[PDB]
């Protein structure tokens, strides 16, 4: 009945020293029934990464919508959109559906190509921007993720250390949520290289 | 209501009852539940009264316009789909319909389409629709064959409505029979259930449970 917890799923993002990390589970369900273990929730438009939790049809629809908009942006501007600018575009796009909203929990992550500054941001289903220095959480196990991140996190972690922290935050949060799990992916993002790692986790 | 229609060697048999009810009150025992769309096409009536009358008469206007425009008899498939597409537009609004569109053309042969106010459109050989449909199905399924004579097929339809008229409280009054061939339908009379029951009981040896 509650649109935001029909399909299930989670996303988490973190900042480190000259790097950012964004991670998600791979589950798609119909309430109790597990349907797919390959439903990735992180997308990227140029160097800007976007994770989206919530109702799966809207996750897909919004990805297609932002691909659409960032492609037109690039043709007109003659440059790739930056994380700060994209964050504003997500907020604008969600709020235009104020009274008929997409049931989603987006998360932006990336490094500004000019300043080199790491950036993350979160949103509610209707556009409000949460721009945290440390971390952002989203999805059906957001409470769990808040608890993990708040204890595990420390500032200025090196890329390979940050990987371990965000991975352990996701995995242990997902294992305390019935509608999350069935696999996981972690993106480590530096100024001009991005590594993608699939994690081994329990499949129940 | 009990309405049926079935395909066989000799074409299509259509048989309906005559009763209309408002709650437990019997409003009418003389209802024409078969609509003569044209000399070749019949429609049955079940559910709410007006809806099936109004829109199947309307269907006859659309069929007449088709054959005026196309200089050719409308197919049963096309005629049934005009009605189903129309009611699908009204889906949710509260129409109440269960009908069989029956006809016989060169390209199709004898054809029956079950059309429904939820939008359902099904082609088939045997259909029973209404509050007494289950009673009529019993008699049909056990006695139906393809190689039935027009005489025997007519009786089976008459007998199946009687079965439902007896048991179903919201079915009864009288039975209207129709036989559909390629050259058109043929009316086979109004049969009062009050007289038909005692006649069938005596001649057939059935309804031994009832005293007469």
């Amino acid at each position: 009945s509650d649109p935001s917890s029909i399909n299930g799923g989670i996303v988490v993002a973190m900042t480190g020293k000259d790097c950012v990390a964004i991670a998600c589970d791979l589950r798609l369900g119909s309430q109790s029934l597990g349907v797919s273990n390959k439903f990735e929730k992180i997308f990227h438009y140029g160097h800007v990464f976007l994770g989206i939790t919530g109702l799966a049809t809207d996750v897909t629809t919004l990805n297609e919508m932002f691909r659409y908009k960032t492609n037109l942006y690039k043709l007109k501007e003659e440059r790739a959109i930056e994380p700060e600018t994209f964050t504003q575009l997500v907020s604008s796009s969600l709020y235009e559906r104020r009274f008929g909203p997409y049931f989603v929990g987006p998360v932006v992550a990336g490094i500004n190509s000019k300043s080199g500054k790491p950036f993350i941001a979160g949103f509610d289903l209707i556009g409000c921007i949460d721009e945290a220095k440390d971390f952002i959480v989203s999805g059906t196990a957001s409470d769990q993720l808040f608890g993990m991140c708040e204890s595990l996190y420390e500032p200025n972690l090196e890329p390979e250390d940050l990987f371990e922290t965000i991975s352990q935050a996701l995995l242990n949060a997902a294992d305390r949520d019935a509608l999350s799990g069935w696999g996981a992916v972690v993106y480590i993002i530096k100024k001009d290289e991005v590594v993608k790692r699939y994690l081994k986790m329990r499949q129940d | 209501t009990t309405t049926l229609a079935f395909r066989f060697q000799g074409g299509i048999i259509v048989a309906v009852d005559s009763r209309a009810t408002a709650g437990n009150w019997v409003a009418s025992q003389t209802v024409k539940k078969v609509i003569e769309i044209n000399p070749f096409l019949l429609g049955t009536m079940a559910g709410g009264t007006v809806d099936c009358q109004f829109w199947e008469t309307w269907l006859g206007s659309q069929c007449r316009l088709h054959e005026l425009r196309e200089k050719e008899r409308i197919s049963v498939a096309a005629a049934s789909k005009i009605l189903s597409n129309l009611v699908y537009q009204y889906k949710g609004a509260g129409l109440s319909m269960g009908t069989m569109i029956c006809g016989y053309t060169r390209k199709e042969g004898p054809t029956i389409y079950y059309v429904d106010s939820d939008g359902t459109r099904l082609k088939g050989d045997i259909f029973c629709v209404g509050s007494g449909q289950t009673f009529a199905y019993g008699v049909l399924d056990s006695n139906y064959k393809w190689d039935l004579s027009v005489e025997d097929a007519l009786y089976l339809g008459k007998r199946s409505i009687l079965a439902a008229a007896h048991r179903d409280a919201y079915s009864g009054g009288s039975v209207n029979l129709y036989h559909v061939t390629e050259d058109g339908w043929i009316y086979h009379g109004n049969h009062d259930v009050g007289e038909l029951f005692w006649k069938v009981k005596e001649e057939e040896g059935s309804f031994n449970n009832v005293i007469g």
């Binding site: - | 008469t57 206007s61 007449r64 316009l65 005026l68 425009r69």
Partner: protein, 235 residues
């Protein structure tokens, strides 16, 4: 330039008067009304011998009790026929009866003056509407793009109209049979047509109370042409 709905100094609508000129260029159509039925006949006028003449449809059914023949820009007639058929069927739906021939004609004529700056111009086609009803019996109407309609005992429209009308003036009487009317249409069509009249370049039709509106077969018309030739040679 000038308005489409403009009046001339004589008190006529320019566009309506010009559409009447287009009708004069059209192929001939004739109608004769009797107490036994109304007959409708047309000149097909194929532009080339390779054109399959049976595809030329200048006589058209509106309902079982009403038929129609056309002359002029025949493409313009399609929407008029569609409206006529719809009006006939719609009335039957609302009133469970056949529609009066006059009432049908009036409905068609209401379209005529719906043009301005609605459609951009008047119709460039005239219609002969023939039918039967219980109140006024066998009838023949002439529907113009002006919105006016006259009832006729007999009428000819198209390029050979004034010559044919003068012939209909002498030949028509109130005791004509259906057979006599059929031959009379054939006779007058043959008189005004450029090419020689046969079953392939001319078409007959009628409307009777019993059988309704019927377009004649080429075989049936061919016999009536042969019957005509013999009776003219008889004196």
């Amino acid at each position: 330039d000038r308005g489409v709905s403009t009046f001339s100094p004589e008190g006529r609508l320019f566009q309506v008067e010009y559409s009447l000129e287009a009708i004069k260029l059209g192929s001939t159509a004739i109608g004769i009304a009797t107490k036994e039925g109304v007959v409708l006949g047309v000149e097909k006028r194929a532009t080339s011998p390779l054109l399959e003449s049976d595809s030329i449809e200048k006589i058209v059914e509106i309902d079982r009790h009403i038929g129609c023949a056309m002359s002029g820009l025949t493409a313009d007639a399609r929407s008029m026929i569609e409206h006529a058929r719809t009006a006939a069927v719609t009335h039957n739906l609302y009133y469970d009866e056949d529609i009066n021939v006059e009432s049908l004609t009036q409905s068609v004529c209401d379209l005529a003056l719906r043009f301005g700056e609605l459609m951009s111009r008047p119709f460039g086609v005239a219609l002969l509407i023939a039918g039967h009803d219980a109140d006024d019996g066998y009838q023949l109407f002439h529907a113009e793009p002006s919105g006016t309609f006259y009832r006729y005992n007999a009428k000819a429209i198209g390029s050979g109209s004034e010559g044919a009308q003068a012939e209909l003036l002498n030949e028509w009487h109130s005791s004509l049979t259906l057979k006599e009317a059929e031959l009379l249409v054939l006779k007058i069509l043959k008189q005004v047509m450029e090419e020689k009249l046969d079953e392939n370049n001319a078409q007959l039709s009628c409307i009777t109370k019993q059988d309704g509106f019927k377009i004649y077969d080429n075989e049936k018309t061919a016999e009536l042409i042969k019957e005509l030739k013999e009776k003219e040679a008889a004196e």
